[PDB]
Design a protein around this ligand. Sequence first.
Ligand SMILES: [Mn+2]
Ligand SMILES: [Y+3]
Ligand SMILES: [Y+3]
Length: 148
Amino acid sequence: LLRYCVQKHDASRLHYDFRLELDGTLKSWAVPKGPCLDPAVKRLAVQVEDHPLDYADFEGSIPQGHAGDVIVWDRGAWTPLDDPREGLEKGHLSFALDGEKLSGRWHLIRTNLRGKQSQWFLVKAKDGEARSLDRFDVLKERPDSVLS
Ligand SMILES: [Mn+2]
Ligand SMILES: [Y+3]
Ligand SMILES: [Y+3]
């Protein structure tokens, strides 16, 4: 019921935008190296600006001098296993994803370091959907848009 989406943003530096609907907006993290199904791998996820729910369906171009083009790399629904509001606040989200590419449980983990609160890490939870990185790299295996 709660919408999630991952956008592949080919800007100056390639990266993935990981979005989770909550309270009528999309909580968004910029994940430079993209999500990983390997529970042993920790991917940087820099918290960024909230985006409107309809942006989840956006494919196109962020104008030059402002930044490349964007596709919806994955989409579906997400479910928090623990209170999401208190989760973002305390700096830890335990949640499940139900989409095209990413599925199973995940963790968003924020650093405790003062002056670095935008620094999180996206880690795959050990479950049936977990896949070793050297056997299955979801970025390589499923590289294209789910809308076009
Ligand atoms: Mn971006
Ligand atoms: Y509180
Ligand atoms: Y399918």
